[PDB]
Amino acid sequence: GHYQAEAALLQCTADTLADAVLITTAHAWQHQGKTLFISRKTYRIDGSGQMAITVDVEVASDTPHPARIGLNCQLAQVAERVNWLGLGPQENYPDRLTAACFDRWDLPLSDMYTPYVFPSENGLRCGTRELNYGPHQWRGDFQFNISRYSQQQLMETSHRHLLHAEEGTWLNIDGFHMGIGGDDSWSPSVSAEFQLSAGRYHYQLVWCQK
Amino acid sequence: VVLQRRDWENPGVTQLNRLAAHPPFASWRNSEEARTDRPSQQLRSLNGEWRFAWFPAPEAVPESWLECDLPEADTVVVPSNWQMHGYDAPIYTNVTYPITVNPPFVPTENPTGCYSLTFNVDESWLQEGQTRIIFDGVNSAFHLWCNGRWVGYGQDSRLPSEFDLSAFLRAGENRLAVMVLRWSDGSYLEDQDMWRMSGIFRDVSLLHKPTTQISDFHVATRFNDDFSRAVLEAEVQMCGELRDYLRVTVSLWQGETQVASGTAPFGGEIIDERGGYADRVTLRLNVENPKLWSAEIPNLYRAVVELHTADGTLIEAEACDVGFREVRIENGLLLLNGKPLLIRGVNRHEHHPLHGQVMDEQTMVQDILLMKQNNFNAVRCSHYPNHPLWYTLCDRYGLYVVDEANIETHGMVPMNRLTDDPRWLPAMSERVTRMVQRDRNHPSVIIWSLGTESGHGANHDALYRWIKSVDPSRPVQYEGGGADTTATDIICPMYARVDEDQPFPAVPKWSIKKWLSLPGETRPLILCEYAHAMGNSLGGFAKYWQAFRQYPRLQGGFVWDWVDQSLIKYDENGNPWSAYGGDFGDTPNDRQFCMNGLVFADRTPHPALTEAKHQQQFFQFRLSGQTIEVTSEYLFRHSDNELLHWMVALDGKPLASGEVPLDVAPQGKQLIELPELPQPESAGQLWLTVRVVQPNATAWSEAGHISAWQQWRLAENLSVTLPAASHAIPHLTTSEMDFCIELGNKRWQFNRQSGFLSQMWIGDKKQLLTPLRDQFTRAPLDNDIGVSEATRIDPNAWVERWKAAGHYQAEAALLQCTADTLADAVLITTAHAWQHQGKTLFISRKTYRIDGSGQMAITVDVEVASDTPHPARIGLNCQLAQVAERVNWLGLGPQENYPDRLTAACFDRWDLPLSDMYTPYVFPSENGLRCGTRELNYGPHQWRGDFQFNISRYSQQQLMETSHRHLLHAEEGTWLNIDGFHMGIGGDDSWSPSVSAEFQLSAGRYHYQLVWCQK
Ligand SMILES: CC(C)S[C@@H]1O[C@H](CO)[C@H](O)[C@H](O)[C@H]1O
Ligand SMILES: [Mg+2]
């Protein structure tokens, strides 16, 4: 029930600090009674206008290792260039990133999508310390993709030509992403060291307008 | 003439008047006593009180000593090493020779042990036949006198020298005088990495043999393809007068039943143009459905060899135990009885902490039992032939043995300088030939070894061929000169790693997996030495066994090594302590390198032992759903003394358990279906634990002995419940120097100048003696140090990388320290930078959240500079004021375990006295860590999260400043180290960095969290 998991709020509090506002939340993703994931978050918005996000995730040892552990959202803005300090320029994944180089990259948005004839998650870039899109800067140590297509449309659509740009820009920022494999295409092939099996995961982001 | 010749400086002279080598003789005169192996009246021990004097050189020995006992001499026990009686110091040196390398010469100052014994000889022994004396072990050379007259000379410390005394003795009192030399030309071939000692250190005895006698005999066992029929073939040789009426009967016994027999006159088949051996006979006995010998089931028969007249009058009988087994290398696999072996082996030096290198039955038996109880099936006789009882016991309890000639020339430059020299061939041949002649009838001996660490020389090749020529029943191995030379049937490297190539020039140690498939290569690979168990070690041991299991041609190896070579010294009060190199005045020395044991000198286990037992298990396990699949790794036996105990616990609380008998065939499978497991309605992780229990006692184990275990996570139920919110809310008390938080009897204090928790109070009492601070270092392990020394730095060792980067003396610098009162808590934020000479090594970012329930949630995020050497650990430490009796934790245990050595540890709820949380390594270092721990309890304290910890009365600082365990003093309070992350310990070897990449703290950014509360 990974694709159907319903978020159930456990905690949601606010605090006033000397020079910032702290938002603490906790969620449990469940499927018919079973708790798959718990997400514990803090948001820290300070004087300079930076929103520091800490995320600590629990994964039930007996659920199949998840495809990713990140955050997503549909952004309103539609910019033309995607600029980042990280691995690139082309799409790279944890078990397919040796060719990619760490530098400052700048591509058109359409270059951050890969037109696989049968549509799937695509266009990830890894080991990114900084991402710039329109007015938005994200800093940390993460993996991301960015496109006019949602994970939902991508998985619902059998051919690339049947896809339609969605309003705004879909952003996927992953603390962690499972390998893609390919030793064959008829049995699981993602190696143990690229499966998301640690049980407890932590990543942090800073979101400010630059 | 004896002082004149200096035979102890002549590799051309290795003996004078010494009898031929041969298998163990007892000269029974009753065939039944031979069968039952009872004591024989014809073999007398001369063990006991002897007279001993020490001299600085052989020139300093007075000529009267041959005729009269010396009054200044003492009375000492024999066998013994004279260093063990305080006459001089033992020397511990590893590679470098204990003497100046000037072959064939030794120092003029050559410690000389003069031994004597006045003893009785009965009349009966001197009217008929032959009386010989046997010295089983004399280190390193000696001349022998009897009643004033010179008998002979002998070398090789590790094999029997036998001399005919028939013409020297008289009825009544007799006197032996033995001049034992510490150093001789033999020493050049005895450079083993061990204590350098000397003297009559093995048994001395007198054997009476008839004039017409069995002088040698060889037993072979050959089989048809399916092992349903054997032929025992026994070749017997006599000395004395050759007569028609002479016969030999070789008869084979299973208990009290004679299964086969053969009798023949002397005179073997024609051999060449001049005929045959008129003094030899070959007997061949047919054996149907033989009980086969292995380490799993050591089936033995008794062969009695009778020399007699046609009419049936016995002359004498010899005998041995026969194990019916074939050893062959076929198609690149070592096979025993047609099945491929998996060597669960260990190197074992003969060592005793009190008696030095003297061996006794009790110790040997103790060693064998521990070995087998911990899943070993093999031993390498590193690096010399053993006390003769050892092979007998190995035959009977069942271990595969590698018998190794007493040749090591490690300190030579290059290592093969002697072994390539044809002039050292004679001395070398005798050390190989005399071993084969002595041990070739022991079934436990499955492989011959040409010695160790002598490079690869032409002499090795000759002797390899010699052994293959005289004994086609056993493979010959030898590691020197690259481990895969033409002088070895088996690729037998030392400390070759699993996946990691070490491509040294000329002698590369390839990844053992890569080694097998080098172009043209077909041989099996068994490591003669691997997994150097020095101090806190055996990291990465599981990686070896995973590979051994997957690769048919990787057939195991021998751990280095069984027992620490520590020696007992005494202090002023009179209490014993364990001593290593340099502790007897001995210099130069290689310090703690003599301690590489899986067990302490007193035979107490190191934590690593349990890791070896687990990885060396004989039953493998897989879980699918509710089915446990059991696979046997036994080659011959069924699991006819085994049950499986299963157990399911929720975070350590038992919910169900049961028993199923194991009925699995060798190499076979059994599926066990667990009953409906009761789904617990309570948060936690369900764990399954299985243990294989032997319900009946054996020759080597007690009833209820556990031989194997394994764990699995079953279903997990993550906690979704919020704690019941509290009325109270903590109060912040800001000061110039301090942030204080109050809640009820509990109080926290953060020093604003340091940035750390300087103190906590429960009610009135202080909880800390030292503030809670980040720790990035550890008291360096033997593996962290390698061969690095104060006066000869190895900049490659982990410790030196750490020192040179400033890790040990970096100073916390406060970047930030704020306080904030929240709705139901107080939040303390901190930031430190650890710096050394302007370089920022680490940055620690923390928050402490103290809420209204009195719990402190600590969140640590560390940055580690990519270009600083990866740190030993990322954690916190403090010195608690509390000294409690017990430690209670939910994690891996119960014994000490580290990230690369935790497979044997089981997740459960453990409870031990504080003293068990300290590991007494003779050289002190970081110790006692336990990993994957979710909850720690000590007095009123409880920590929760996902961390590793050690807890003890010794600071990391005292552990790293103290050289011996006994010099440690318990500090006030308890040092607590809590690590989010801890580096592997390594041990693939102990002289280069050996910690594998995946166990190094290289991620750059690290996160951990801990809740601290009183309970
Ligand atoms: C390069 C050296 C460390 S050689 C190393 O010394 C070890 C110390 O225990 C063992 O004696 C090994 O047999 C030897 O190979
Ligand atoms: Mg000599």
Ligand SMILES: [Mg+2]
């Ligand atoms: Mg050596």
Ligand code: NA
């Ligand atoms: Na194997």
Ligand code: NA
């Ligand atoms: Na050693």
Ligand code: NA
């Ligand atoms: Na130390």
